[PDB]
Ligand binder design. Sequence first.
Ligand SMILES: CC1(C)CN(c2ncccc2F)C[C@@H]1O
Length: 284
Amino acid sequence: PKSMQCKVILLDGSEYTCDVEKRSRGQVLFDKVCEHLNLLEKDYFGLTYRDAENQKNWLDPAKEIKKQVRSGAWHFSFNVKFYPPDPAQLSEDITRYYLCLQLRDDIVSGRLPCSFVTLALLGSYTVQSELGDYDPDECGSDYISEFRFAPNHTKELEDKVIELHKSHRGMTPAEAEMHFLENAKKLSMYGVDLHHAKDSEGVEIMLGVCASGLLIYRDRLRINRFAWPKVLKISYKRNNFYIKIRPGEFEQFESTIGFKLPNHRAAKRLWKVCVEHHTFFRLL
Ligand SMILES: CC1(C)CN(c2ncccc2F)C[C@@H]1O
């Protein structure tokens, strides 16, 4: 029974290696990674892989791995797929811990924009969880942490992390991680998956997929929002993605809204993540 070597980048930046039978479904690999991580609340998470042009796709746990990675290497990342709108309602601390690791990379990568003060507050809770109580011995007036906190580190930001870290004396790691999450969950781009597109007039927009629905960011005009319960059908055709905005009160007809994506694969990818979010965030 022939087995393929899998390499998975974990949210701590380390590499997990395992083997699965070459005809394995994505769930087989995901179960092995989640067991390695002691993760029970697995529904929020998934595996990604970089495609024949370094774009990230979700590995579908119900489909053969080989029919997804196709000609590419069996190399994956472990990631949050569905960002819980209220992380305090997760059953296990270790789930919150992995969500913190994902958010820390969302912040350093700049996918999750963050004010100076929130960068320093989030950083202060991470230091508290990892190192425990502030120690002056591990920090002179010239201290720079090993912790990556932000897309662009400054001495001012390092100083503000230390100032806030001093305020958290006696805080336990689960407690610090919950405070991290209480702040992060409020950020306007928390759990927003952004996709480049054009409106029906060729004007560049971003479409954001998240728990609360689909976001249109036209930038120069406004930000339109479609709560999932106002969305009846999602579809793609060629390079186009369409959303049927259910007819409101006393309106005769449903309404359909169309977008142009970079290529057909980018339309299919946006359709699949919307369908998955619609399903997941209907069951809350
Ligand atoms: C500053 C934003 C929130 C908006 N945005 C846009 N990018 C290109 C075209 C149009 C846009 F709206 C990037 C980011 O998501």
